[PDB]
Design an enzyme around this catalytic site. Structure first.
Site, PDB file in Angstrom:
ATOM      1  N   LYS B 111      49.563  15.518  37.070  1.00  0.00           N
ATOM      2  CA  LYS B 111      49.467  16.461  38.209  1.00  0.00           C
ATOM      3  C   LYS B 111      50.751  17.270  38.206  1.00  0.00           C
ATOM      4  O   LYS B 111      50.797  18.316  38.848  1.00  0.00           O
ATOM      5  CB  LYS B 111      49.274  15.747  39.544  1.00  0.00           C
ATOM      6  N   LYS B 187      30.845   7.115  31.341  1.00  0.00           N
ATOM      7  CA  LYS B 187      30.380   6.045  32.207  1.00  0.00           C
ATOM      8  C   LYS B 187      30.081   6.586  33.597  1.00  0.00           C
ATOM      9  O   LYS B 187      30.585   7.631  34.013  1.00  0.00           O
ATOM     10  CB  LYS B 187      31.413   4.919  32.295  1.00  0.00           C
ATOM     11  N   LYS B 190      32.114   6.563  40.484  1.00  0.00           N
ATOM     12  CA  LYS B 190      32.089   7.128  41.830  1.00  0.00           C
ATOM     13  C   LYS B 190      32.911   8.411  41.906  1.00  0.00           C
ATOM     14  O   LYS B 190      32.607   9.292  42.722  1.00  0.00           O
ATOM     15  CB  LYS B 190      32.587   6.104  42.851  1.00  0.00           C
TER      16      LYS B 190
END
Lengths: 334, 311
Positions: B111, B187, B190
């Site tokens: 970041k 995969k 969430k």
RNA sequence: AGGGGCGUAGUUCAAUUGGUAGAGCACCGGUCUCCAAAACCGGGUGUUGGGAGUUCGAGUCUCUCCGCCCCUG
RNA sequence: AGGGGCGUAGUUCAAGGUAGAGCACCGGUCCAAAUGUUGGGAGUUCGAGUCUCUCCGCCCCUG
């Protein structure tokens, strides 16, 4: 009444400059102001140090404040670690403080063996310290305006997003106490962090040590010798007068008149007997408090109880604004 | 008994991959292991977001774990913020984690590549995750979702604090244990914006049927995975499925299979979720049980560190 | 978790090519001041990270441990 | 506390003369695939994304 947050760093022998310039006048302002004195031990572990020494240092710093005159009835006096809300708000404020702000702090950017996240992250915690108690007067510490500015930036950045949860704190510049300048650099003021301790004189110093230190103080080579107040030309002698005037209350012209025809070896000795005389009473007291293990454990217990009450109010308001679910205390908790 | 700590992100909505991948098993493991479930709401604020949503989320997430089978009286489930020990130890462990180690972290450095909220939070969080773990004398940590470095650091800090003060902490160890629909090569997570690419534990058959119908159909891996699911949903194997099994039948069959797997889950959630007094009791009991353990570790740290103790 | 590196008086630095660990600054005395400074005049720093090797000889070569620094995911 | 810089659609972007992209995702196989608010306001101007001022957010810097 305005609420004032001061932090007591557990290390760092209070100097006569600290006492007469600041804490002495603040002892006389506990009824007009709501003064809070927090022993910031969680801020000290940023630097590695001896566990028994810090424990004793915490207890030393407590007794001396008491010895300096802080009344635990009027004023709130506690150990930072004993009031969890400090770490707790500290974490939340990390999320409203920006990397660059923390890294451009002049101190850290300077530092080289313990660049720990403590060292980097301390200013957020120091803003959590101030903001819990809805503080509005902060006595701007030494080389730490940056820090209060960052507290003000944080509190505005939070309040702007969520409402006046916090009071924006303003710096405290009370009645300027005595002017105590370093004994070998009277251009510089006396600093508790001075690596060379001959420029300083701690509140718990042997009458011999007081003498030895004021004896080495810089004067001038004026012939004839004169005891006059000229801050430009006679710094060291000016300083000796500002100290003495502070201990006694006598004016600079009164002192000049009193020392007409006296040399500096006399002024020194006179200034040392006056300093050490003041510190005998405050040292008598200190040991009473430092020996009274019971009384110490009580001032802590009572003091943290008063803090952690005022802080959970604020912490609840924060966690509410934040988006958190409240802790479920008891069925009939409100 | 081996103490297992697992953190529950409030905001992320749980996927069938999570349940059949881990939870469903773990649910039937709460008697052998000492399982701990911490809804990490303080790790959630490192990103800005809607305050009210989080609250709900936390609870939604809590109630979903209780529905998937987690016993509040066999395991310790609780909300991170309701235990102060976490920030208390987070601060102290901040002073024993090095600036380099933190900046070196993959998640931050990146970041810091570009760059939205580079806050102390995005930086100091791996220390708080270390507090999360060491508080409860954790023995095993399920490491997943690119959090292996975060355990390594947690191990490395525990080794460091212990090496200076005493063996107050235990060195955690990595517990040794479906792909995304429109990207089987990837995969099912969430933390994927495309929720068409995922399938929620609380999705209704109509929405479940709808999402799978668009599944991309090892060389036909969308098929392969769509079968693997049933393999774990039905209990059958690949040969039994390679024999039992157009592609609409497979699609229609995983629909009725998975939504049939979600039934007692969903039906339990709606009773738990609305019974706020029950939630209130579960958060109170877990939190009381967590503090009792965490405050024990914390007392030891505060003595080693040199702090004056309270009373 | 792997992968690289660094470590010398209080401090900032030397010690060529493996041959006697030295400087600045700071500090300490001495002189010097009524005292101080300054000024001269000297002085002393050191666990060469700890240990083990190699060599006639190790701050310099090797290993090992320690601590920290840097890198990756 | 001060001093510079930046701000365009979901995202990265293009362009004192009347705002174009790309990527992203939404539309059109058994099944699946395979746009304008130029940060806000106010100016100068015939005309402002562009120039001045001011504010807001963030970035950089100093103690």
């Amino acid at each position: 009444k305005p609420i004032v947050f001061s932090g007591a760093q557990p290390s760092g022998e209070l100097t006569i400059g600290n006492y007469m310039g600041a804490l002495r006048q603040w002892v006389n302002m506990q009824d007009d102001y709501h003064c809070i004195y927090c022993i910031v031990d969680q801020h000290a572990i940023t630097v590695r140090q001896d566990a028994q020494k810090l424990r004793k240092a915490t207890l030393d710093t407590l007794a001396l404040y008491l010895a300096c005159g802080i009344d635990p009835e009027k004023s709130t006096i506690f150990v930072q670690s004993h009031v969890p809300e400090h770490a707790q708000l500290g974490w939340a404020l990390n999320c409203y403080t920006y990397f660059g702000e923390l890294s451009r702090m002049t101190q850290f950017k300077d530092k080289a063996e313990n660049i720990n996240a403590g060292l980097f992250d301390y200013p957020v915690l120091m803003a959590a310290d101030i903001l819990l108690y809805q503080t509005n007067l902060v006595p701007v510490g030494e080389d730490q305006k940056q820090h209060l500015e960052l507290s003000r930036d944080i509190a505005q950045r939070f309040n702007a997003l969520y409402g006046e949860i916090f009071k924006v704190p303003e710096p405290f510049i009370p009645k300027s106490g005595a002017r105590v300048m370093s004994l070998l650099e009277p251009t510089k003021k006396m600093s508790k962090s001075d690596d060379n301790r001959n420029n300083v004189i701690g509140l718990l110093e042997d009458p011999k040590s007081v003498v030895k230190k004021i004896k080495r103080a810089v004067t001038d080579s004026d012939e004839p010798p004169v005891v006059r107040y000229d801050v430009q030309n006679k710094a060291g002698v000016s300083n000796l007068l500002d100290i003495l005037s502070a201990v006694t209350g006598q004016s600079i012209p009164e002192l000049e008149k009193q020392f007409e025809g006296k040399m500096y070896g006399h002024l020194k000795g006179e200034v040392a007997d006056a300093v050490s005389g003041m510190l005998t009473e405050l040292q008598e007291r200190y040991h009473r408090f430092r020996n009274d293990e019971a009384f110490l454990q009580q001032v802590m217990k009572d003091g943290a109880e008063k803090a952690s009450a005022h802080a959970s109010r604020t912490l609840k308001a924060v966690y509410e604004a934040i988006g958190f679910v409240a802790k479920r205390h008891h069925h009939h908790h409100h």
